[PDB]
Design a protein around this motif. Structure first.
Motif, mmCIF file in Angstrom:
data_model
loop_
_atom_site.group_PDB
_atom_site.id
_atom_site.type_symbol
_atom_site.label_atom_id
_atom_site.label_comp_id
_atom_site.label_asym_id
_atom_site.label_seq_id
_atom_site.Cartn_x
_atom_site.Cartn_y
_atom_site.Cartn_z
ATOM 1 N N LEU A 16 61.026 40.690 82.565
ATOM 2 C CA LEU A 16 60.605 39.386 83.066
ATOM 3 C C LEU A 16 59.224 39.018 82.535
ATOM 4 O O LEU A 16 59.027 37.934 81.988
ATOM 5 C CB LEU A 16 60.593 39.386 84.596
ATOM 6 N N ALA A 17 58.271 39.929 82.700
ATOM 7 C CA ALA A 17 56.908 39.701 82.233
ATOM 8 C C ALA A 17 56.892 39.282 80.768
ATOM 9 O O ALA A 17 56.294 38.268 80.408
ATOM 10 C CB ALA A 17 56.066 40.953 82.436
ATOM 11 N N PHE A 19 59.135 37.937 78.914
ATOM 12 C CA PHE A 19 59.664 36.587 78.765
ATOM 13 C C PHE A 19 58.608 35.546 79.129
ATOM 14 O O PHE A 19 58.310 34.648 78.342
ATOM 15 C CB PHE A 19 60.904 36.400 79.643
ATOM 16 N N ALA A 20 58.049 35.674 80.328
ATOM 17 C CA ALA A 20 57.027 34.747 80.797
ATOM 18 C C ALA A 20 55.826 34.734 79.858
ATOM 19 O O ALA A 20 55.237 33.683 79.603
ATOM 20 C CB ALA A 20 56.592 35.110 82.209
ATOM 21 N N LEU A 22 55.756 35.156 76.679
ATOM 22 C CA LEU A 22 56.079 34.370 75.494
ATOM 23 C C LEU A 22 55.994 32.877 75.792
ATOM 24 O O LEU A 22 55.475 32.101 74.990
ATOM 25 C CB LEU A 22 57.479 34.723 74.990
ATOM 26 N N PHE A 23 56.506 32.480 76.953
ATOM 27 C CA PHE A 23 56.489 31.080 77.358
ATOM 28 C C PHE A 23 55.062 30.539 77.383
ATOM 29 O O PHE A 23 54.795 29.437 76.901
ATOM 30 C CB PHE A 23 57.131 30.917 78.737
ATOM 31 N N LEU A 24 54.149 31.322 77.946
ATOM 32 C CA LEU A 24 52.748 30.923 78.034
ATOM 33 C C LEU A 24 52.098 30.905 76.654
ATOM 34 O O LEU A 24 51.225 30.084 76.379
ATOM 35 C CB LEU A 24 51.983 31.872 78.958
ATOM 36 N N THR A 26 53.681 30.286 73.801
ATOM 37 C CA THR A 26 54.231 29.158 73.060
ATOM 38 C C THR A 26 53.529 27.858 73.435
ATOM 39 O O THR A 26 53.088 27.105 72.566
ATOM 40 C CB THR A 26 55.742 29.004 73.312
ATOM 41 N N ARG A 36 53.699 19.761 66.125
ATOM 42 C CA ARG A 36 54.919 20.530 65.915
ATOM 43 C C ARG A 36 55.209 20.694 64.426
ATOM 44 O O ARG A 36 54.983 19.778 63.635
ATOM 45 C CB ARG A 36 56.103 19.849 66.604
ATOM 46 N N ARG A 37 55.711 21.866 64.051
ATOM 47 C CA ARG A 37 56.030 22.151 62.657
ATOM 48 C C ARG A 37 57.506 21.889 62.372
ATOM 49 O O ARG A 37 58.383 22.462 63.017
ATOM 50 C CB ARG A 37 55.684 23.602 62.318
ATOM 51 N N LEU B 16 58.694 35.306 88.716
ATOM 52 C CA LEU B 16 58.974 35.629 87.322
ATOM 53 C C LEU B 16 60.210 34.884 86.827
ATOM 54 O O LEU B 16 60.175 34.226 85.787
ATOM 55 C CB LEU B 16 59.173 37.136 87.157
ATOM 56 N N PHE B 19 59.680 31.213 86.123
ATOM 57 C CA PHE B 19 58.933 31.034 84.883
ATOM 58 C C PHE B 19 59.850 31.169 83.671
ATOM 59 O O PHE B 19 59.895 30.289 82.813
ATOM 60 C CB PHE B 19 57.798 32.056 84.794
ATOM 61 N N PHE B 23 61.185 28.486 80.583
ATOM 62 C CA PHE B 23 61.030 28.789 79.165
ATOM 63 C C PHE B 23 62.341 28.574 78.416
ATOM 64 O O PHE B 23 62.361 27.991 77.331
ATOM 65 C CB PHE B 23 60.553 30.232 78.980
ATOM 66 N N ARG B 36 63.468 16.189 65.482
ATOM 67 C CA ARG B 36 62.130 15.779 65.889
ATOM 68 C C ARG B 36 62.051 14.265 66.057
ATOM 69 O O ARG B 36 62.683 13.515 65.313
ATOM 70 C CB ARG B 36 61.096 16.243 64.862
#
Lengths: 39, 39
Positions: A16-17, A19-20, A22-24, A26, A36-37, B16, B19, B23, B36
């Motif tokens: 879980l950690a 995953f979270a 990565l979200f933060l 990103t 955005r690319r 968790l 969150f 994501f 896009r």
């Protein structure tokens, strides 16, 4: 402000950690870059 | 088909999960569109 902290589902907290985390990461980069690319 | 199911960090799993859920919702939305948006 002060509470206990016992172990509860390691494999769960780990996954879980991650995953979270990565979200933060990103969203953090998205704002910092502010662009955005494309493909 | 048959597995255990014991309690392990409720407040943790709840937060968790939420969150991580967001994501996946964000990546799914952007990917789903696969296009896009211009100015």
């Amino acid at each position: 402000m002060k509470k206990d902290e016992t172990p509860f589902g390691v494999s769960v907290a780990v996954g879980l950690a991650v995953f979270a985390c990565l979200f933060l990461s990103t969203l953090l980069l998205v704002l910092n870059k502010a662009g955005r690319r494309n493909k």
